[PDB]
Amino acid sequence: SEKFAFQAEVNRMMKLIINSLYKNKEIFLRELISNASDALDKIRLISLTDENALSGNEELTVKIKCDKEKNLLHVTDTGVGMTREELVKNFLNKMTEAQEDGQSTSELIGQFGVGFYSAFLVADKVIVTSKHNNDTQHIWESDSNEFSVIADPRGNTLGRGTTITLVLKEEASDYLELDTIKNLVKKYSQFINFPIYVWSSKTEKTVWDWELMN
C-alpha cells in the first residue's frame, strides 16, 4: 500500500481529453489498442538485441475480455510491460491553440501518445496490472482523483505484459456487449501488426474461446 496524487499538468490533461472527445467516447478503445501496439512493438525490437527477451511469454497478442456480471472490461497485451518506477512516475500548448480555433484535436491525443486517460470517459476506476522482464508484477489503481502503486500479491501471473481493467460507468454498460466490442476492434485494428482476440460465445449449448478480429 502507497497512495499518490497526480501532477497539476496531468490533472489539467485529463479534463482536456474528456472535453475534446465527450461525444466520440468510443475513442478509448482505439487508444487502449494503440498502447498495446506500442508495447508489443517495443518488446519485438528488444527481442532483436536480447535473445532471452521473450522468455517471460512466447506469445505476442492482444486479448480483450468482457465481464457483464462484475461490470468489467479487460484489455491484456503481452508487450514490454511497465516497471514500478514507470507506474509511480506517470501537448498542452498545441492542444489549447487548436481548441480556441475550433479545429479537430482527436489526432493530437494519439500523436503525443497520452491517450491512456481517455479510459476515464467510460470508467469510474482504472486498474493497470503490469509485468516487465527484470522487475516484479505491480498494480496501478485510479478513480482520476488519486492513484496507488502496490506489489501484486498473486505474484508473476502475466509472465510479461499489461492488463487494463475498467470498472465501467452505468452509462458505459453498452461496451460489455461482445458485438459492440468486436465492431470497435475491427475499426481501430487496421494499422496493428499483432493479433487481437476477443473472448466470444457462439451458443442450449455454449462454446467459449478467443476469436481473431484482425
Ligand X SMILES: Cc1cn(-c2cc(F)c(C(N)=O)c(N[C@H]3CCOC3)c2)c2c1C(=O)CC(C)(C)C2
Region for 105 from its dihedrals, namely left if φ exceeds 0, alpha if ψ lies in -120 to 50, beta otherwise: alpha
Shortest distance, position 92 Cβ to ligand X, whole Å: 13
Residue number with CB closer to ligand X (91 or 207): 91
* 75: its cell numbers: 484489455
User: By C-beta, is 140 or 194 nearer to ligand X?
Assistant: 140
Q: Is 193 annotated as a binding residue?
A: no
Minimum CB separation of residue 200 from ligand X in Å reads 22
Any binding-site annotation on 77?
A: yes
Give the integer Cα–Cα distance in Å for 106 and 28: 11
CB atoms under 10 Å from CB of 71, counted, come to 17
Exposure b/e, 160-184, CB count within 10 A at least 16 = b: bbbbbbbebbeebeebbeeeebeeb
Residues whose CB is less than 8 angstroms from the CB of residue 37 and which lie 6 or more positions away in sequence, other chains included: 62, 191, 192, 193, 194
The minimum distance between CB 42 and ligand X, in angstroms, equals: 5
11 is in an annotated binding site: no
Nearer to ligand X, 139 or 176 (CB): 139
Whole-number minimum distance, CB 6 to ligand X, in Å?
Answer: 9
Which chain residues interact with ligand X by CB under 6 A? 35-36, 38-39, 42, 77, 79-80, 82, 86-87, 90, 114, 116, 128, 140, 162, 164
Contact status, residue 198 vs residue 184, Cβ threshold 8 Å: no
- Of 140 and 197, the one with the shorter C-beta distance to ligand X is 140
List the binding residues for ATP.
35, 77, 90, 116
